[PDB]
Amino acid sequence: IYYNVNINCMDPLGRSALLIAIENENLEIMELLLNHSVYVGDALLYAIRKEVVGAVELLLSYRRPSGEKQVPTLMMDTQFSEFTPDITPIMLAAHTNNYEIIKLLVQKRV
Amino acid sequence: EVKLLLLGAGESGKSTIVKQMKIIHEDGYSEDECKQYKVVVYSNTIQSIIAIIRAMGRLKIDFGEAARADDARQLFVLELAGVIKRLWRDGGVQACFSRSREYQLNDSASYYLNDLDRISQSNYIPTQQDVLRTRVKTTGIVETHFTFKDLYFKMFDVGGLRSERKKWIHCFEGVTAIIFCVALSDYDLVLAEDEEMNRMHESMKLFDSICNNKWFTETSIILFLNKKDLFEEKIKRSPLTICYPEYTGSNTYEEAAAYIQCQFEDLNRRKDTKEIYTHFTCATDTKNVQFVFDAVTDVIIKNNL
Amino acid sequence: RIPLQIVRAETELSAEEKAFLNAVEKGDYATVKQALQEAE
């Protein structure tokens, strides 16, 4: 209503609100930040490295429903990525050695 | 190319500036286009007198004459011209009109109601000023294209109300300039969507958002302190302290206007980095808007060299 | 490229069974009691 706060704002350490929700494993705050259409770029990599099954399930399952008018336009958040740009989610899941995330990724034709 | 956003709270004058970009930069509304606004003039007139009558209950105001009670019943069901005239000229109705800050009344109400004889003729064709004075809410975006000084203006009119905010985020890409409209005459008014919210504080907090947003670091920020004509009249009867309890200046146009300008310009949190280009405007005055928009265009050219 | 598939068949759990196991994992007593009472 007021446009006061950029929801995709970063911190001094390079984490966003969604990454802070993922690191603390707050599924409620994670889904609440997802419901307002925040930026979701590379958050699945942070969830896979954190080895949270519920966060990986939420990031896999929420990206499909309720996508309307592209994404809201956002600029200059995309420079800082802890994960390398060559990395893909199945490869990082293989590096993490977690079984459930690998199974959920393999089920989706990867 | 110049991407130009018209922003501001509800009823601040955005779409009226858009109407002016038609006539000022182009042949403008045709008789036939004027005729299309007749039903809007009528609706604005009828809805305005209804609003005043309705408010008389909330305000504990009686009709100057008992005979108006049946005119009021007739008005709601609906000869119509006669009924509206008698109501409008009633002393109770006029007492309520005088207190319109205590309810929600269109700015052009008295404009039309005072011209009822003219607008009620069977052959009535709205004048260009009648069109400029019309009130039609603006929901969604109104992108129109115009060319000034050979610039290809891509102009975005958007809804000023808080319900219309969702559309604003999509249009923020590549904005050369924002004209942010503020109704000067709103210090004592409350929002239609929130009657515990003063309109001028709402306009400040948005301007706090829009001026300091990181999307508009390189965008030229133009402030139209609009409805200068209405403000000039109102300031002589409604004190600025309603809005700004700390104000110790005069209730005169020049001093009170200057103070409002200062309050808005103070919201800039990057004053040693960014200008606000402020103009006092009457959006319904073609000559004024042409002069101001010319000046604005010069600022935009100079800022894109 | 290299295709990848589940070589050995693990049957997928239904929505109600997955919700029941998640409720048992989170320790919510009332939801597990409601599911057990609705199971029969």
Ligand SMILES: Nc1nc2c(ncn2[C@@H]2O[C@H](COP(=O)(O)OP(=O)(O)OP(=O)(O)O)[C@@H](O)[C@H]2O)c(=O)[nH]1
């Ligand atoms: N006389 C006069 N009337 C004005 C002035 N500014 C606006 N109005 C009138 O007051 C109303 C406000 O103008 P609008 O174009 O509806 O304002 P807006 O900001 O576009 O409104 P939204 O549709 O809510 O965005 C209209 O009826 C205008 O004719 C002004 O400076 N002088």
